[PDB]
Amino acid sequence: NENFEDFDVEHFSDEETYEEKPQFEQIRRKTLKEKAIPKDQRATTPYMTKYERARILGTRALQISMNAPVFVDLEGETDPLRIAMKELAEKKIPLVIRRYLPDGSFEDWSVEELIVDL
Amino acid sequence: TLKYICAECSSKLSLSRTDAVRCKDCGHRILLKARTKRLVQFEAR
Amino acid sequence: YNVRMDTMANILYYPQKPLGTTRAMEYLKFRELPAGQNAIVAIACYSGYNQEDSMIMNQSSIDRGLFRSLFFRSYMDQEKKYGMSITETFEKPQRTNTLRMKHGTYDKLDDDGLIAPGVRVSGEDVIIGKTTPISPDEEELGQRTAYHSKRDASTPLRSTENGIVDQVLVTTNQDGLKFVKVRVRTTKIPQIGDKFASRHGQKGTIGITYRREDMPFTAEGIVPDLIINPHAIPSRMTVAHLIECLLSKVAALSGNEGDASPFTDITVEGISKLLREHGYQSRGFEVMYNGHTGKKLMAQIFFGPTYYQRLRHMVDDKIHARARGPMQVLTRQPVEGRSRDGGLRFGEMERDCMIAHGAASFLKERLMEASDAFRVHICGICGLMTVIAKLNHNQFECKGCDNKIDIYQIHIPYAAKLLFQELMAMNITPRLYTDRSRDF
Amino acid sequence: MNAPDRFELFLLGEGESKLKIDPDTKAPNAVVITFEKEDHTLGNLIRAELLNDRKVLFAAYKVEHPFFARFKLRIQTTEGYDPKDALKNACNSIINKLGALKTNFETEWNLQTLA
Amino acid sequence: MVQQLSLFGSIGDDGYDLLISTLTTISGNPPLLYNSLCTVWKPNPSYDVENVNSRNQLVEPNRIKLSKEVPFSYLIDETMMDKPLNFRILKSFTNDKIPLNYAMTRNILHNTESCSPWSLQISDIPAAGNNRSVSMQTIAETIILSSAGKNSSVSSLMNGLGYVFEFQYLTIGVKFFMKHGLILELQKIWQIEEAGNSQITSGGFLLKAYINVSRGTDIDRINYTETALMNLKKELQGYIELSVPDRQSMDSRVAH
Amino acid sequence: GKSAVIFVERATPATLTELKDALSNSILSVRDPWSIDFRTYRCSIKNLPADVSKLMYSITFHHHGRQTVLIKDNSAMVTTAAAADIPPALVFNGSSTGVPESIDTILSSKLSNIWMQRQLIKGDAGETLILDGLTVRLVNLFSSTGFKGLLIELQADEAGEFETKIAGIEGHLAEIRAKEYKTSSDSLGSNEICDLAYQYVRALEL
Amino acid sequence: MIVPVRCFSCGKVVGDKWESYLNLLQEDELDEGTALSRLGLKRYCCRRMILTHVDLIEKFLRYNPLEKR
Amino acid sequence: ELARILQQLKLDKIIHVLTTMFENTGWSCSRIIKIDKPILLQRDLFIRLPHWPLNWYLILSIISSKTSCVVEKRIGKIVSQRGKWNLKYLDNSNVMTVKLESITYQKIMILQRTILNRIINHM
Amino acid sequence: SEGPQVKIREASKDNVDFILSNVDLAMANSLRRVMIAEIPTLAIDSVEVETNTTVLADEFIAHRLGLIPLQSMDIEQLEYSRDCFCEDHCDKCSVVLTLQAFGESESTTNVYSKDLVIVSNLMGRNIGHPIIQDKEGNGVLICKLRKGQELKLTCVAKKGIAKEHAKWGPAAAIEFEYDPWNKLKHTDYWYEQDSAKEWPQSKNCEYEDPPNEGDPFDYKAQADTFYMNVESVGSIPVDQVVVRGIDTLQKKVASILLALTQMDQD
Ligand SMILES: [Mg+2]
Ligand SMILES: [Zn+2]
Ligand SMILES: [Zn+2]
Ligand SMILES: [Zn+2]
Ligand SMILES: [Zn+2]
Ligand SMILES: [Zn+2]
C-alpha cells in the first residue's frame, strides 16, 4: 500500500458530499419524405460549422487511409488528414451533411456548397 | 547443499531440502542465504 | 537499516547536517540522522527550465553523488499447508512439470527456489520460486499433460524496478511454516521529474540537468548544485529561505553552524555584516558568468548553500503507460494500478470536458474501443439480451419469443451489458430497441 | 529508465555526420550548418570568430534543445564569398590563435620555477 | 532483399517431353539444361547459442545453403559424350545412379587453395497471410567469390562462421525464360550421401515457376508478378495443376 | 600484382595532405576517390574450445567492385554484393536471385546470434595517387571517437621490384616525422584482394 | 555515511582530508573554520562538504558483521 | 556562350598538342596542380621531366585571341603547403614568347639540353 | 608571438593562476569549458566485486572508486575501449586495479586508495596509479572495516571525458574573471545606498587602472585580460590541464575543418 502526506485530491469523488448532504406534429409525422426539407427553403446557415469541418476531415481522412480514390492532384502529400484538407480547400469532397432539426426534419447541405469560412 | 549463515552467531551451515531451517550451534531460527560466489559487475558511475 | 527487513527503505548516500540549524533539532537528533543535503543554490532565471517551481540540478554534482539514494524493497513469501497434500513448497520450478510458469527468467534461482544475495535482478524476474500441487489429468490451456503435477505460485520482482538482491532471510513463522524475505537494493540517482523540497514549503521537481561547463559560475569557479526560480520567492513570502541561505553561506565561510532558531535576536543585518568581513556582498549577491559564453550576467545572483530534501516521489515510480493490458474480472475494463499494467481513469468530468469540446467520436472511442467494446445480440420482439448465438453454425434464436429471423447485433460497453443484466436480476427489463416508436 | 546514454553527447551515431549544410532561402548567399554532437563550447567560438570577418554579414548559432547535443549555425556572407570558405577561415584563425596560445603558455610555464 | 513469387507442381517421366514441347510453344524459348549442387549447413549443435540476436528481437536458428554448378563432364559417365547437352538427357536420369558421388562432393567442399564461386542463400518460411494465391518466400543471398589461406576450404570457413554440414543435394533440370521475367524450372533432385545417392523426385520431375522481385514492398510489382503467375496457371489448366506447397515443407528452420 | 599497407597509428588529421605534399614531386597522376569500411565481429558462443579465435574482420573496399572480405584465423573469404561481378553461371543456374545483399548486413541482421558487430572504422573521401609505375592511396580512418590513424595503400602491377619502393615510402614517412608506423606486406598461404585484406588486418592490429 | 570522495559542486578531492580534519579538531584544538582553511578548502562548497558531513559509518560499524570470516 | 566555348576549344587544342609533344618524348606533364591566378584568354601548363632537381617546373603559358596565339616560357619553383600551392620562386627575367607555328620537336630537345643547365644555374 | 598572451602570476602543483590577454571572450570561455569537460582522463569505470562484507553498498563503493582520481599523464597512449578490438578490456585500452582489504585488527581498518594495486601491464606508461596528495601518504578514504569484514574487488579503469561522467574531470574549480572594475558595464550592480561601497573589490582590481569617474563610457572596448585560476584534481598536472585543454579545443576545430573539407571534396 501507500502512506503519503502529500494531499493529492481525490478527483471524481463527489459522492462523499452527496452522502453528507442527501436531504433537502403539424407539418411532419413518422419518417415520410416530408422529413426531407427541400433545397429551396433550407433555413440553416450556409457556412460549414467547426464540427462539420472536423467530421468531414475525419471521415475523408479515414477513407483516404482506407484507400478511397482522391479527387485532387497530390503535391507529394502523404498524410490523409492534409490530403483531406486539400480536398476541402478546392472542394473535392463528395459528401453531404444531414443537419437534423430538433423536430426530426433534416436539411441536406453538400460540402461543395457549404462555405468554409473558418 | 546450500550455504547459510546464522543471524547472530554467524555460523556457516549447509542445508538440504529435508533439513529444518534452524541453526545447529545456537538454536536460532533466522538464517541468511550466503553471498553468491560469482563475480558481480558494477559500473563505477 | 542493514539488519532491518523493511518493506520500503530510502537511504541517502551522503546525508549532511544543515548549515542553518535550530537549537531544538539536537534533541531531535537531526544532526546525527539528517534528512537532506546542503546544496549550493543559485536563485536565478537561468534557462527558463526552472519555471513553475521547476529546478535545474547540476549533472556534475549528480555524478559526484548529490542526493543519490539507496532504495531497499523487501518481498515476503510463505509456504503454507492448505491441507494434507495441498502444501506450498520453495523450489526451482521446471517448465516440463509445472503449469502457468511466468514468462520471466527462473535461471537466477538456486535449488532452494531463492536467489543468492549479490545477484543483479531486473523487472519480471522470479526471485522466489514456489510450487503448489494440482489435480492430475485435467484439460486447461491446451498445454496440459500428465507431467504437470505442480503449478507455479512464484514471486517475481516488480516489473518496473530492478536492482541487486541485498539480503535473503529464511526463517519460520509462528506456525512453524518456512517463510522467506528477500531485500533487493537499487540506487535512485536524481533525474528530471524527481521531487525535492527545501525546509520552507518550497517543493519542486527537477526541470533539467546541466553539466558544470553549462552551469553559471562565479569568479571563484563555484557553480550551483541547484537553480531555483526567483518567482517562487515573492508571492510565497518565504523570507526564511533567503535568510537561511545567507546564514548558511556565513556558516560555511566561518566553519560554524548557523543558529536558525525562531525567536532569537539574530538579524539579517548581523548575518550580512559577518558575510562582509568574510569578503562577499552582504546581501548574498554574487557576480556570476553565463556558462555558455563566459559573459557576465547583467543581474547579480543570490547565491549560497541551502538545505534541500530529496522527496520520495521519483518520476520512475510514477511513469505509467498502457496500450493494451489485463482486464478486470467483473467489468472487463482496464485494471487499476501501474504495477498491474493498468489503465487510466477517463472519468465523468473528463468525459464532460470532451462533451464541451464536441468530440463525440473521440468520446465514443474512449468509452468503447479504449475500455470495453462488447458485441451482443438482441431481438426485435423483446429488447432483452437473451439471444443464443452460434456463430460457427450461423444460428440465432431467442427463447420465449421463438423468433429466429429478427435478431439484431449491437455494440455496447461490457459495463452497460452488466448493468442491463443486473437490472434483469433485480427484475427490471431494460429492453433495447433499434427503431424509433414516437416522434421527436 | 528513459535517460539517454552519456556518450551520445559527443559520439556520432551510425549514419550521421559531424556537419551538414543546407542553403537558406530567407537571405541570399546564406547557409545553415548543423553541427552534430557539439555544443556551446564550439558554437560561441566559431560564431564569434566568424563575426570578426568583415565579409560575413550574419553569424549566429543556437542549441535548439539542451537534451540534444547539436547546434545550428547560420552564416550569411557578402556576394562572391562562400560561407563554407568563411567557416574555413574562421576555423583556421581559431587554430592559429590556439597554437600561439599553447606556445605562449609553454614558454611562460617554463619561465615559472616555483612549481 | 528478394521475394520469390512461386508456384509448384510435378509431372511423370512419360509426360516430360510433352511438357517440354508445350512450354516451348508457350514461351518461344528452348529449354535450358542446368545444375546446382546445393550444400546445406546447420548451426553447430556443440555451440551454445542465444535465441536473441545483436538487437532485442528473438530469432530461430536457420539452415543456410550454399549452391553452385557442377560441370557436366562430371555428370557424364563416359558413355554419352556424343549426345549434346539438351533436354533429352533428362530421360536417362531416372534411377539413383549419378556419377557425382559423396567422395567427389567432399573433395569439392574441402578443395583438395582458391575455392570455386558459391551462392549463399538463406530462406525463411513463406508468408502466413492466407490472401495470396502464390507462395511468397524471402531469400537473402550473397556470392562467395574466392578464398585463401592454409584453412581455405569452404567447409572450414562455414565452420568458422559456426555452421556444420547437414546434407547436400544435386538438382539437374531445364528452365524456360518466358514472358516478363518468369523463370519456370523443371528438375530432378538427388541426395548425395556416403551411403549412396537417392532419387528424391522418384519417377517424375518437379515444377517450380517463380519470379524474383528486388523490392517486395512494391505492392504493384507483387500483384503484377502474381497475376502473371495466375495467367500461366490459367494457360496451363487442363493439363497440369499449379498449387501452393506447404509452408511447413518450405520452412528451412532447425526444429527442436 | 602486389599489395602492401602502412598504418600510421599516432598521426595528425593533416598527415594525409602533408604526406601528399611530401610525395608531390613523384606523383604522375590522380584518380577517383575511394572509400572503405572495417567491421569487427565478436563471436557470442558461450562455450568455445581452445585454439579458436572469436575475432572476425570484415573489410569492404568500395573499389575492386565494392567487395567484402572476411578474415578469421588466417582464413579469407571474398564476397560481393554487386550484380556486375557475379559469374554468369550462378545467375543462369538459378543459385543466385539476380541482386545480392551484403554479407555485413546479413551478419548484422540474421547471423547476429553468432557474430556481433562492435567496431566500425569508416575511411571515406580518400584519394588515389599514381606514382611512377605504382599506386599509393590515402584515407583518414574514423573510429567512433573520430580520427584513429593514417592509412597508406601500396599497389604495384609488377611484383619483381617491390621492396625498394616500400622502403622508399617508409623513408618518406620518416622525413614526414612518423617513426612508429606498422607496415604489412604479408600474404596468405592467394589473390590480390584477400592478401590486401590480410595486410589490412595485420596493419590495424597492434 | 562515509566522507565523499569529491566535492559535489566543483569536484575537488575532499575524501583524503577527513582524518586530517578530525586530527586538527581533536589534537590541535583548532576551531572548524581554521581546520578547513589549513586543509586548504577555500571555496565554501568544499568547506561545507567536510563541515556538514555526518560520518555514520562507525555507527554502522558498531553492529556485528553479518558474514564473518 | 558559343564564342566562349570556341575560344576554350582554341586554347584546349593547343594545350592538347603541346601536352602530346611533351609527353611523347618523355616529359611528365602534371595535372594534379592548380594555381588561383597565373598572372584575352590564357592557359598555363606546369611541365616537368624527372631527371633534374625537385620542386621545379617550366610554366608554358599560352595566350590566345581571335587573331594570333602565342606562348610565354618561364621557370618556376612551386611547393605545396597544407594543400595550398605557392610559387616559391618566379623567373620573369629570362622569358621568351614563341609561336605554335614555330615550335617543333628539335626545339624541344634543345629545351631539354637548356633547362638542366638553367636549373643548375638557378642556385 | 602574435596572438593570445599568457602571464602566470602564481604557479603550484595543483593550481595555476594566470592572466590571458589579447584573446576573445568566446575563446577564453571555450578553453574553460574544454578544461572542465573535454580533457581525457583515466578513472575507474568497471567494478567486479568478489567479496563485500562491509557496511557500505556495492555500488556505493563502486561510485567512490569511480571518483578516486588516477594518474592520467600518458592517457593519450591509452585507447578508448569502445574503439579497441578486444572483447571487454585489455592492456591497450584499460588499467586493471585490485583492492584487497581485510579487518585483521581489533580497531577499524581504513581502506584507502593507496591499497589499490595495479595488476595489469602498464607497458611503461605513466597511468593507473591513484593520486596521493596529503602528507600522511594515504589516499582517499574508500571504506572502513570492522574486524572480520572483507572487501575484495577488481577495478577496470578506462579513459573518458567529463561529459560522460564527472569522475573523468581533472579541472576542479576554474576561477574566471574579466573587467574587475566593470568598465565594460557587463554587470549592473545591485545596491541599496552605494554600489562601490556595498560591492567588495576583487583581487584582480589591482591589475587594471580604476575608472577616472569623469571620463565617458568606452563603447568600443571589448572583453580581454581574463584572470583564470585552474585547479588540478591530481590526475594530470595543472599546466597539463591548460595545455591539453588548448590542444583538445584545437583538435575539435581541426575536426570541423576536416569534416568540412571532406564533404566539400565529395
Ligand atoms: Mg502543483
Ligand atoms: Zn546460530
Ligand atoms: Zn426475445
Ligand atoms: Zn453462453
Ligand atoms: Zn568544492
Ligand atoms: Zn582493449
Numbering used by the authors:
A (entry chain F): 12 to 35, 62 to 155
B (entry chain L): 26 to 70
C (entry chain B): 785 to 1224
D (entry chain K): 1 to 115
E (entry chain e): 1 to 112, 159 to 302
F (entry chain f): 2 to 190, 194 to 210
G (entry chain J): 1 to 69
H (entry chain l): 548 to 586, 620 to 703
Sentences from the paper on this structure:
Single-particle cryo-electron microscopy (cryo-EM) analysis led to reconstructions of the PIC-cMed complex lacking the nucleosome and the PIC-cMed-nucleosome complex at 3.0 Å and 3.6 Å resolution, respectively. To build the PIC-cMed structure, we first fitted our previously reported atomic PIC structure into the cryo-EM map of the PIC-cMed complex. Focused refinement of cMed then led to a local resolution of 3.3 Å and enabled us to build and refine an atomic model of cMed that was based on our previous partial model. Further focused refinement yielded a high-resolution reconstruction (3.1 Å) of the central cMed region including the shoulder, knob, connector, and hook domains and permitted the localization of additional densities corresponding to parts of the Pol II CTD. The obtained high resolution of the cryo-EM map enabled us to build atomic models for three CTD regions which we refer to as “CTD peptide 1”, “CTD peptide 2”, and “CTD peptide 3”. In conclusion, we obtained an atomic model of the yeast PIC-cMed complex that includes the Mediator middle module, Med1, and three Mediator-bound CTD regions and shows very good stereochemistry. The structure provides a detailed view of the interaction between the Mediator plank and the Pol II foot domain and Rpb8, which is mediated through a hydrophobic and a polar interface. In contrast to the human system, the TFIIH kinase module remains flexible in the yeast structure also in the presence of Mediator and was therefore not included in the final model.
At gene promoters, RNA polymerase II (Pol II) assembles into a preinitiation complex (PIC) which includes the coactivator Mediator. Here, we describe the PIC-Mediator complex from yeast at unprecedented resolution and provide a reference structure for initiation complexes. Moreover, we observe three Mediator-bound fragments of the C-terminal domain (CTD) of Pol II which stabilize Mediator conformation within the PIC and significantly extend prior information from the human system. We reveal two stretches of the CTD bound between the Mediator head and middle modules, as well as one CTD stretch at the Mediator hook domain.
